[PDB]
Amino acid sequence: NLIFDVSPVQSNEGMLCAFGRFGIKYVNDKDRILAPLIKVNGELSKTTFDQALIETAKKLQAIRASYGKDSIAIIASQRLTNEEALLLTKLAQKLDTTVIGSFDLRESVLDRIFGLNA
């Protein structure tokens, strides 16, 4: 369950940079969290996945109830796969919010000129 090395493929210049070659070290990091945390007595404590997910759903639903539409922001990392991003959009749709974005997301200008930001 440990990563020991990384090799570039022999495709085009067969090159990786410092990130792609050496930043995979976070996979073996001992500081990775493996269990969820919920706030009991005002401090984060370990719990089970079912309890944490139920707590998350109830917290988001309570916010939506007491504050209405577009009251929850879903800020997602751009390293997630396409399926996870699409599922997050569907979750925003079910949570009754259009505020889904990223803090790393640059302002778009190509969709105003050519049609697609691509």
Partner: protein
């Protein structure tokens, strides 16, 4: 659907009785539910138990109101095995010890008795 809003154990009782009647009907011998006759003691008053040692009930653990009003977590906790055994040991064993083999009970339930006269 039949009795209107009640508690859940009433619905479970209705479902079990209906299952019994349906099982009888599926055999072509539809039988209504018959209530057995039990001998009871309605004359018992507290001084009949004045010699028993008094023991406290198992305390019920309740989550703090301030923290619990903000979440949907369970309010009460399940008791421990020690507390369970100590609480079960408080029972006075009111039922007859021969209930499952008493021939008098069996016979008075085989014949429709009206013993109050």
């Amino acid at each position: 659907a039949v009795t209107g809003p009640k508690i859940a154990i009433e619905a479970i009782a209705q479902g079990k009785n209906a299952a019994r009647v349906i099982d009888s009907y599926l055999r072509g011998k539809l039988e209504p539910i018959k209530e057995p006759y039990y001998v009871k003691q309605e004359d018992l008053t507290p001084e009949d138990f004045k010699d028993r040692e008094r023991k406290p009930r198992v305390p019920l653990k309740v989550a703090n109101a301030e923290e619990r009003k903000n979440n949907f977590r369970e309010i009460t906790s399940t008791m421990t095995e020690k507390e369970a055994i100590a609480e079960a040991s408080r029972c006075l064993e009111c039922g007859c010890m021969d209930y499952f083999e008493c021939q008098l009970y069996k016979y008075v339930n085989q014949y429709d008795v009206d013993p109050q006269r």
